[model samples]
Target chain A: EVQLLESGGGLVKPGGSLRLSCAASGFTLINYRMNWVRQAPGKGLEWVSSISSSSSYIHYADSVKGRFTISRDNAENSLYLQMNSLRAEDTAVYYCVREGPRATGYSMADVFDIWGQGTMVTVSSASTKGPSVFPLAPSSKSTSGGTAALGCLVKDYFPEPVTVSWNSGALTSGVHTFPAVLQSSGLYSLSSVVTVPSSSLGTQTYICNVNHKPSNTKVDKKVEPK
Target chain B: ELVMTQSPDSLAVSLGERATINCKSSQSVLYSSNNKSYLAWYQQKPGQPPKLLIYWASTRESGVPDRFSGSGSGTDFTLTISSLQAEDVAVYYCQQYYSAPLTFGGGTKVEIKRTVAAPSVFIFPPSDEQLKSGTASVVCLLNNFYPREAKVQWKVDNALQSGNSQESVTEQDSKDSTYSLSSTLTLSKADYEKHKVYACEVTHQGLRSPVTKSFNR
Candidate 1:
């Protein structure tokens, strides 16, 4: 029984967590394993690990030993992904993939053989409502326009929260990490700075990708030369 | 007795990096179900719960990305890391959902390398089968498994094959948390090593890392 992909999502206001779900179709969750991965706003994909529905086996990879864990219920075909420290970058879409029987004709191997569409989380309205996006206007003090700085700020996500990067070519680039502050409401206040040059300016475009697993993947926001 | 062993059980990832993990077994997790092997895979994160990833060595848990997959069969397997992402930075593991002791490989840290490319899981049917004088040997098969990792054995006229010639060893893959094994025995068909009494011994490795399985033909 194989069919379409399903995931969970919701709105929990600023500084609040929004739990999401990524369900599979046409397959029995009881007989399959589920996993979670995240895609930062502009960054690539991240493997969050997986869990088994049959047995409560814990497989933590590297440093994730202390940060990640996988578990499941045999009855429902659904797996849950939970992470503390809810930040904007953590707002990117999340997915639930199946890990079927191994050493057989239908194994998912070590990769996310199946994927969900992903859920998106927006941190706003509750925290200090500041500029969601800053103007990418080129610096007025241009010294032959050798280099320019483009600024883009995201208010509702912070505290080592979001990541920013440049998508110069066909390559799907990564995100730049930033130090964020927590607000009184328990939300985060984060911002990003993108530096550009007149030469690489037109040749490349700038973007900010958010990593919000269990919610969204690659929260794409682009910037152009003024 | 079956014992599963895995290597390098941890991983780390940057904001947009990639990482991978591995698992191997002391004995084959293969069980004869419709004359087929029914192995499976899984994952476990920190604080949260473990989820299903691969089963039958290639089938993905619904919604898994195209980047992740299962491959290999019999005594060899691998778990590839195409790309890594910050969100991907975490621990990963593998196991056979077939027979007990259902075992898992040591976990590996996964970090964001650059771009993340999905992988696919693929498993091959048992390539070789040999039937000796006393017993016709074939891979054990299972269908609609209950709790993976159940013991299997063989008998002749309601009596255990007492030859004690069957020997099982563990071999782990370089990657993925899956163990493979081969059980061999030297028994005459006229005595007990016949088709009438044959089974794969399985142990339940639920919480711990090492599991055991023994086959008597």
Candidate 2:
């Protein structure tokens, strides 16, 4: 049986990056490559980057740059990933995976087939830093008729919450707004539902925006349903 | 970047039971190569770290059992809960040691669940063994059932008798819940029989290799 082992545990500090490793054995060392991925809690998956078995290749996303590098210990058939600068949003489970060679019709480039048990790294390393976030299910559905209800679920809260909006420009002049609702899960799940007619649906775009304390303004949805 | 860890840490298995492990990555460590993504899989046991079971994703690791395989790509991948006897019970993990954020699937701990009441054996028939006047047979069967897996073979007068050839077939006795697989040898019986002994071999996962048992004719 082939095995991949991961080591590293616990919390991290805000603005500080983390590192993880995926070690493998009983495999053809030169025949395969490895990868790294991020599971932002209840949120969707984000691609980090990957490395080759020969240590000749490395690619990464711009947002993860502060401190990230990929290297391998050829003697052990093991590969390593490092994250330099860390931040609150950087709190998430990180993983390493292996890839196969290229074929005529099937190849494993940019995709992962095997995965390591993940390392949970919470930014701030301190328990008082608030629970690490696990994004909730994002809402992106159309309501009956020309109306639509949407929500952008974001986990992790250090400060108070803000209202979500419907910025479809659906309103010509008079459009009433409501305060955002905070759920019991400790996380913020702000929602906004707006009513629009079939003809006016094409008039403008509806955006769900949030204004936070530290100039952290985030948007939930951008709807332009026609 | 991403990191990975396993939960419950470890597990115990009987001589013939099944076990499982979970894997999670910090990021989507997928990359594009020749149009298909590359994926690798692995397993580790007590006193040991990890071993490669599948590579390039679902393809079996070299010389690995069919029971060990990989599935799911991109964000999700699964290691099988296949036949798990005491010897099979070990720490299992999935690794994307291939991509950056280099991550591993959470590991599930495994160990022997129960001891076998009876020993089991495995068989690997000779390359050729005559059956009837017109047909020959060489069968590989097991003797001891411990680990619920063993090896068997057909030999002649201790000379390492490797007889006829036959297709491989696996069967399980639901009543005892013991798993068994077989490889047969077939040939013209009239020509061969000078030295014949059906042999069985018992093997364990932890061992570097398997031990054999013999039946003489």
Candidate 3:
């Protein structure tokens, strides 16, 4: 069992350097290799760099050769990606990925096993502040035979990464976090949802809370009965 | 890099009947001089790591039942089970260790077909070989058995030697699809003289009684 998360978001000026971090848990860091991949807006994915924890061996993509460096700290269970002389064209979402077989005596091409959520970095001249927390709005979807799902959408925030949680009354199922999307203008959007058993409608209220850590702000919205 | 592919995907055989799986490699894995293939087969059951069954193409791992045998050379290979047992239901994979980027065949699943057959067994005479130092080994070779499963015990002057002993994994005879098992008991000069008779007892499910082979010093 292995898990990875990418963190570090903000705008960096052209010619400036950026370092992104990937925190891994639940597996031995020394056993596997970590890789960095990125995707430009409306573009396919690209491999950036890879670092072997056991042997400290490193590999760099031809495009990023001599510009990106990949390293890791086994004791801290973290992989680091350092890029120098960045350009606006470098604006994209980066992901940390893990590959195996991790044990000794494996002579095969490393196969990917785990991936971290993407961390978007902006290489723009104009610096921007943290995200603007938006209010959650109720969205209802019709299910089979007179049942519907009650959900909420959280949209449009800047300096991009955000986390959302919910406080709700009795529900029939667990919460679902929809895929977060990065917009053309460099902001991000996502949604949270849960199914309403159709019988509990109008009897319960649901609350959605959004947190934008860099701005130290939290927004709470309640979905009233329709 | 050598590519391996196993055929038929899956098959079912009655208990005590034969099952054969084939694995093909992209290129030859045999070294001309040694005439050995750097191929191996593994058995992977649910919720468990893959266990090595046969290595170097045809040599079975230590303690592996004789019924599970590997044969063939170069690029074409086969692993045949003379008789399928209840516990033999699992997936099998073929792997090559000849070069980097070691790869394995997809897999072959085996299922029990609800019928049965017993194995044939024979115990050969014990033979001794002198070692570099002042020690000798008494070898017991069990030949041509079906179903592949067997247990062996060693005794000195009618007393059991209750310790670990060296035994070869069961091997299959490619021609007839039968199995052979072997084990060796090493004794120092002093220990060899201490016992007037050394015996090797083989027990198999197919046999009503155990077969015993002995040597007198």
Candidate 4:
């Protein structure tokens, strides 16, 4: 059997960087493709990256795009995964797996022909911090439609579970908030949006209130209708 | 081949005593065109791979000991040892080849009343960390043996590695009195891809021969 192996049981501190790869044996590696997938405890599997067996093309997931690098050494028959700016959410068992085309061209992937014993990566976070709030901005300087969308950008936070709300009026609706995302610099970023009547675009005042848990920090930014 | 089940997972036989093992197949292992039953018997001695004993029902492999013989046909078979010898204490298995996909029976362990705690060995591939960091280190672990001292070495393509490999400190497993230890070998990943097989050969006093396990074989 073609033996593929990856190290496991490893840890890294928050904001730190680490690398993982696979050692190949028993067959010619160039004849097959490889991908790196990880599964968190109690969470489903996530695709981190992949590379062509021929090393011609490589792909990365939207979540890890700038922070993860996938490379291979054909001579050594090894694939390398270099990652940086770690966070607790990144903790998981990452596997180096193989995929071959299904009988029908790219119809349904017969991925994971073989799998390496995965390596476990853990990010240790022991601190909590609040975010810095920025003034509210109109979605593209106020939507031309009857309702205008307002947005607020939140930056640099910890311990997810954040809230961004808007002080509203009679015509208010369309309140949407996104989960916080970890950044390359080891911080976090988030955004929330709300909508109001077009006639109220510059005629009324709005307040974007952002709150962080554990830290108990509340930030308020007022926007005079633009 | 037919699904095969052997009698008595194991048995204790005294020196100079006869040993008999029975094998039953899910279906007949005899072909209609050929009169002979397609069955084989094998013996796996201490620290060695299984060796073919009897093939095609009762024909012995070249140089097989005369004391070992096979009988019966169709769905039933028997392997007999005229007299058990101390050297014959090992695992015995039966295989069927009347069809493709040769099937084997769970082994019958042939043993004497007293046996030493032979060192059991296993090989672990390089860890995820080592692989990610570009280190091709394989580990040979030995445990559960009476004698405290043992020899472990890494052989690539049967070529040996000298004292350069790190034989980590051997510690007695706290739960049990047997000694346990592991050795790490950093072989070139490039060389391993070149059809080189890596083996962890373990030698202990209790074993008649070194217990050799490998990867990429």
Candidate 5:
């Protein structure tokens, strides 16, 4: 049941440095190895770097060899990836993956069996524009017949990955988020759906909020039950 | 470096049935000193990241279910689900940690043989400015597909154009356990305006009919 979470600063300018941290919980860090993997916009997956929890045996993908550094803070159960010089191509959804249980020789060659929600990095200038947002009311396509669901569509954004959230009254569970995708137009699109109990639908207004920092914009759309 | 290749790119299995996937390596991934193969298995459902299932060739990871098992060694490996359940549908990948530049098999996707889910299709049309450059690229994105197996075809004015098209590896979304893939088709700008009709057709096991999205110049 161990989980990994990634957090990092946003909008790292070209040639600027980027530092990210992946924190682990529910298990001891010393029993596993952690790695950093990323996927650029319109590209395949790439292995950025890896660090052994037991010690400082770190390995970097050839592409980021010299400019990237991988380290760990055992006391905090945290793994760090630091890059000195960032390029536009470096902007990607970076993920942290944990290897299998500790074995005597476990290292980079092993499989990453566990992964964390990805943290997106946008290495671009600070002049991009925010995406247009559209929020829709409850749809009949919900999982349960009596339940209500909402969909938020954010389109035409740049620098890839965007996050969306929903806010409503109490008595509801959490939100379900989909991956932000890079469209063919050189922009990005994301879909966020939220489920609410039928009883909480009428007379209630929910807010669908979108955040894209590299574009320096945040928008919120309010929708009520249909 | 040991290269791993998986066979039967995709398979459809019924609930409560067995699903077997094979992974072969170019060289032995077994370490003679420890007598353990440096191989591992993973399961990727849609909307979520890949999860480790087995390691050390055949040893199950902690908390893995009894229904899932791993066997084989050295240059060959197999990940078998004793009784495939509705939740067992996903892409399975085998990887070797025997050397630097760790490598993974392409992937074997499992789906319910009787039915499948059609993917959500999105098309990004090329702009006029891009066409003026003598070349234009049209990207087709197929998202949230079940069974993790699908194919895409592109046509310009009813004629198929397959060259210079690149498809990214299929990726699973950890949250919803659905798969997503993107394909880019680069063609001449003159052909783009001449055709006036660009279409991307997607076929998957789950769809009774192929899904086609079109763009007009």
Candidate 6:
């Protein structure tokens, strides 16, 4: 059985990008092939891309072959769909599907199964704007403890989807992100936290990076240890 | 298409006797370093979903009766019921999982009459006292066979030894569809002590290859 790695949707502006993933377990991921399928509103399913069992061959439909890349991580047993230059027509529920091996009473139907119910991706034409970054806030023990915690609150973002990273070198283990919350005022805000060794406190020069697709910017906010 | 074929479109056996079914695949399902045959068997009975009986060719499913067994490799296989029971009548199918676009055998139904089942081969040698005498009889029993055509003879040192072999009439199971036949070879005690190998060679229509049982010194 496949426990999908992706649980969110796409809410990006046109000409933006979207990244989706599928994780499989309960069986060997490297022993089965999976393909991505898409279903648009009032339309039928469309086969978009596929990746072979060992991640040996990645195939894509002609329509998406130009800007989409399907790949896998053998070590992690995950399949990913990365698409660039998103368009409005790209809005749909995407699926990662595999073939079942059982057939009962001479019936071959009911053999194709899905990784997860489905992941929805929507491309918004308007109502998209740049996100605002609040100053990086540090905890009281920010510079004196075994580890320091830094908070980055991003607000006023449109189209919802965003990416948060850190200036910390190749360190992703302590990064935690909260889902964006929509305010009654019609805008969305998100919070991300990063924990690092207190030894790098004062001299580390910590900076939080936020990528807002609509704004076409990845703004950075710095917080100097006190 | 993998195209697997199963014998005995249907079978009717006497209660408390053995039942047998055969399935042959056009291509071998045997795969890999572990040397596993990707074959699986299922039982479909009245008013219920099919249940898995055996997998990996011969590995029985947990909770299934020990009387049910499967054995074979390469392109041929057999499914046997050590002793058939009244409630065991059902349809069975064989499946191969070595490749995609997977397919199943035609399936065999057991109402339970005589059908095509490979003979279970055996050799019954004379007692030590009988072999110690001037003359003795060694028997080769091939039972649970169907479709009739078969050959049986004795071979010494791999060379054919004709005439001394007396074949028995093909007999059918009193209450089931299975059949049996036996052949006895009369030989001198001198030869029994000679340390030469005596083999009972058998060939039947249901067998993919001849079966040989030997009496070793």
lDDT of each: 0.43, 0.48, 0.64, 0.65, 0.72, 0.66
Q: Model 1's A-chain: what TM-score?
A: 0.45
Quote the lDDT for B154 in model 6: 86
lDDT score of residue A113 within candidate 6: 38
Question: Model 1 off-target regions past 4 Å?
Answer: A1-7, A12-94, A98-112, A118-149, A158-185, A190-196, A200-226, B1-92, B99-107, B110-217
lDDT of 6 by residue, B25-110 (tens): 98998876678787878775532234668887898877889999999997999999989875677778787756544556777877
Query: Residue by residue across A1-226, what tens digits does model 1's lDDT show?
Result: 5632555454444445555555556777765556666544433344465666655654543423443345565465666655443544455545565543442222324333555655544544443222233322333321133655443434344222344444533333212123444444454544444434557767776666555342343456675554
Colliding pairs, model 4: A6-B128, A7-B127, A7-B128, A7-B129, A8-A119, A8-B128, A20-B132, A21-B132
The TM-score of candidate 3 is: 0.42
Best by TM-score: 5
2 or 5, greater by lDDT: 5
TM-score of 6: 0.32
In candidate 6, list every pair of residues with a backbone clash.
B11-B112, B11-B113, B12-B112, B12-B113, B13-B112, B17-B84
* Total clashing pairs in model 3: 2
Best by lDDT: 5
lDDT of 2 by residue, B85-198 (tens): 445654565656444444555556565544453433323222211122244333343322334444444444444435343222222222333333333433445544555655
Candidate 5 runs further than 4 Å off = A9-14, A27-33, A39-46, A53-56, A88-91, A100-114, A123-126, A137-150, A168-185, A191-201, A213-219, B114-217
What are the per-model numbers of colliding residue pairs? 176, 156, 2, 8, 15, 6
lDDT of 3 by residue, B110-199 (tens): 766532223322222222213333554454545445655678798879988754355543323323344445454656666777777778
Q: Could you tell me which 10 consecutive residues in candidate 5 chain A have the lowest summed lDDT?
A: A135-144
Ranking by lDDT: 5, 6, 4, 3, 2, 1
Clashes by residue pair, model 3: A107-B101, B67-B148
Reference-based lDDT, residue B180, model 1: 28
Q: How far out, in Å, is residue A199 in model 6? A: 2.5
DockQ of 3: 0.01
lDDT of 5: 0.72
| RMSD, every candidate, angstroms | 28.1, 29.4, 30.2, 29.7, 8.3, 33.8
Number of clashes found in candidate 4: 8
lDDT of 3 at B125: 22
